[PDB]
Enzyme design. Structure first.
Site, PDB file in Angstrom:
ATOM      1  N   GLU A   1      51.054 -22.587 -10.518  1.00 16.50           N
ATOM      2  CA  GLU A   1      50.905 -21.619  -9.439  1.00 16.50           C
ATOM      3  C   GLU A   1      50.451 -22.332  -8.170  1.00 16.50           C
ATOM      4  O   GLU A   1      49.642 -23.255  -8.221  1.00 16.50           O
ATOM      5  CB  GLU A   1      49.878 -20.567  -9.884  1.00 16.50           C
ATOM      6  CG  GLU A   1      49.460 -19.545  -8.836  1.00 16.50           C
ATOM      7  CD  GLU A   1      48.749 -18.335  -9.450  1.00 16.50           C
ATOM      8  OE1 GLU A   1      48.498 -18.332 -10.674  1.00 16.50           O
ATOM      9  OE2 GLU A   1      48.427 -17.380  -8.707  1.00 16.50           O
TER      10      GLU A   1
ATOM     11  N   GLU B   1      60.351 -16.902 -13.594  1.00 14.81           N
ATOM     12  CA  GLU B   1      58.953 -17.220 -13.313  1.00 14.81           C
ATOM     13  C   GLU B   1      58.735 -18.601 -12.710  1.00 14.81           C
ATOM     14  O   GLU B   1      57.628 -18.880 -12.235  1.00 14.81           O
ATOM     15  CB  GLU B   1      58.103 -17.028 -14.573  1.00 14.81           C
ATOM     16  CG  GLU B   1      58.241 -15.575 -15.043  1.00 14.81           C
ATOM     17  CD  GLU B   1      57.124 -15.037 -15.896  1.00 14.81           C
ATOM     18  OE1 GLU B   1      56.101 -15.711 -16.090  1.00 14.81           O
ATOM     19  OE2 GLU B   1      57.286 -13.905 -16.383  1.00 14.81           O
TER      20      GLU B   1
END
Length: 232
Positions: free
Chosen positions: A78, A56
């Site tokens: 992100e 991730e």
């Protein structure tokens, strides 16, 4: 737990935000993580958590030094921060001026996850979601919170990997047999398991097998999730 030198071997190219001391402090808030079961079960659990984290947050590339699984823990936030990741909630109301995009090792996302995660940790993550990207102890705690917390009907990934989840007859019929594959199913099975494109799940497995090799443990059974349905 995990020695500093082993953490620095697994995460040799990480973003230095993610210190070993911060990981150790976070794990002390979840003392059964990596301390449940016999030696092989503990190693598999640690490898499984770190594999998902690495997938991730990876900054790797195919010719990277030390190979494509050595670049976990590079990302904090992100990239695209245009969406607010807010679903209106009367229980976890979206704070004016704040956004709930992915942050930390398991990319905690949405007001409806920042809220309960914060409550469990004793931190106002709902009203200060940026905390996760400011403080690596908090960042690691959000990831361990996810790993350690059941969300009925789903067991915790911790319980799956340590023998504390026994599948129901319906789980078994659906192919949900304990192992690494079920953890991928819990984390993101609707997109990555069943009939989803298997590429992301297979990448997670490759990290897990690599980390098990480095820790000196068999990866165990039921690694794939293509032959299992997401939890209802």
């Amino acid at each position: 737990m995990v020695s500093r030198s082993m953490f620095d071997q697994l995460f040799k190219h990480r973003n230095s935000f993610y210190t070993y001391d911060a990981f150790i402090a976070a794990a002390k808030s979840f003392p059964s993580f990596g301390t449940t079961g016999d030696t092989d079960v503990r190693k598999r659990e640690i490898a499984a958590f770190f594999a998902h984290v690495s997938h991730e947050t990876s900054g790797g590339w195919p010719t990277a030094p030390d190979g494509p699984y050595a670049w976990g823990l590079v990302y904090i936030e992100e990239i695209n921060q245009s969406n607010d990741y807010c679903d209106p909630s009367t229980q976890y109301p979206c704070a004016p001026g704040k956004q709930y995009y992915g942050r930390g090792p398991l990319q905690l996302s949405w007001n409806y996850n920042y809220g309960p995660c914060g409550d469990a940790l004793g931190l106002d993550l709902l009203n200060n979601p940026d905390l996760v990207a400011q403080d690596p102890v908090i960042a690691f705690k959000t990831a361990l919170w996810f790993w350690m917390t059941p969300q009925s009907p789903k067991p915790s990934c911790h319980d799956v990997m340590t023998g504390n989840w026994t599948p129901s007859s319906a789980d078994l019929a659906a192919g949900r047999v304990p192992g690494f594959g079920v953890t991928t199913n819990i984390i993101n099975g609707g997109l990555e398991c069943g009939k989803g494109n298997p590429a992301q799940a297979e990448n997670r497995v490759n990290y897990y097998k690599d980390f098990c090799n480095q820790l000196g443990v068999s990866p165990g059974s039921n690694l794939d999730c293509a032959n299992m349905r997401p939890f209802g």
